[PDB]
Structure 1
Amino acid sequence: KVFGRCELAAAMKRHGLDNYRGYSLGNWVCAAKFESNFNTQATNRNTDGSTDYGILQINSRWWCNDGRTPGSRNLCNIPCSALLSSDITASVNCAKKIVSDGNGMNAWVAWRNRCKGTDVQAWIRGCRL
C-alpha cells in the first residue's frame, strides 16, 4: 500500500508514534517518506546481504527474520514479510524498539540526513488528526 501523507500521519498517531521517545509525529512521517516513499512493500537489498523492509526500511541483520541473512538476529521477533503489510502494526512495534535502543531516530540514516533539524511539522500540516 502506498499511503498518502496525511493518511499515514493519522495511522501513525493511532499507533502511538506521536511523541514516542520524544519524536513528534512529523519526524516519523518524514522518515517514512524518505525511507520508502510511503510504500509499505518497499524492499532494498544491502551489499552485506541483509535486506530492508517496509515503510521504515527495517533491516534483517538485527530486527526481523528473512531466512537469508546469516548470523543475523530477529530482535523484533517477526518475519520480515510482516513489515510489508498494508497494516502498519508490525512496522510500528518494531520501530518503537529500534528508536529506544540508544541512538534514537539516528538509527534511520535517511532521518538523520533528510529530516533531523528540519521543519518536520510541515509533514503533518493541514492533516485532520
Structure 2
Amino acid sequence: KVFGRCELAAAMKRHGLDNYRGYSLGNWVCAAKFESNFNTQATNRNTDGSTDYGILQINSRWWCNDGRTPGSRNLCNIPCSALLSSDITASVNCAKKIVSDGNGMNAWVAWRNRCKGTDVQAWIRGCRL
C-alpha cells in the first residue's frame, strides 16, 4: 500500500509513534517519505547482503528474519515480510525498538541526511490529526 502523507501521519499517531523517544510525528513521516516514498512494499538490498523492508526500511541484518541474511539477528522477532503489510503495526512496533537502541533516529541514514535539522513539521502541516 502507498499511503498518503496525512493518512500515514494518522496511522503513526494512532500507534503512538508521535513524540516517541522525543521524535515528533513529522520526523517519522519525513523518514518514511525518504526511506520508502510511503510505500509499505518497498524493499532494498544492502551491500552486505541484508535487505531493508517496508515503510521505514527496517534492516534484516538486525531486526527481522528474511531467510537469506546469514549470521544476522531477528531482534523484533518477526519475518521481514510482516513489514510489508498494508497494516503498519509491525513496522511501528519494530521502529520503537530501533529508535531505543542508543542512536535514536540516526539509525535511519535517510532521516539523518534528509530530515534532521529541517522543518520536519512541514510533513504534517495541513493534516487533521
Structure 1 equivalent of residue 72 of structure 2: 72
Structure 2 equivalent of residue 43 of structure 1: 43
Q: How far, CA to CA, are the matches of 1:119 and 1:59 in structure 2?
A: 26
Query: 1:35: how far off?
Result: 0.1
Structure 1 equivalent of residue 14 of structure 2: 14
Q: How far, CA to CA, are the matches of 2:100 and 2:64 in structure 1?
A: 16
TM-score, normalised to structure 1's length?
A: 0.99
Q: How far, CA to CA, are the matches of 1:38 and 1:18 in structure 2?
A: 17
TM-score, normalised to structure 2's length?
A: 0.99
Q: How far, CA to CA, are the matches of 1:117 and 1:16 in structure 2?
A: 23
Structure 2 equivalent of residue 89 of structure 1: 89
Cα deviation per residue 1:56-108 (whole Å; 9 max; x = unaligned)? 00000000000100000000000000000000000000000000000000000
* CA RMSD, Structure 1 to Structure 2 (Å): 0.3
Query: 1:47: how far off?
Result: 1.6
List alignment gaps of at least 5 residues for structure 2: none
Aligned residues, how many?
A: 129
Query: 1:125: how far off?
Result: 0.2
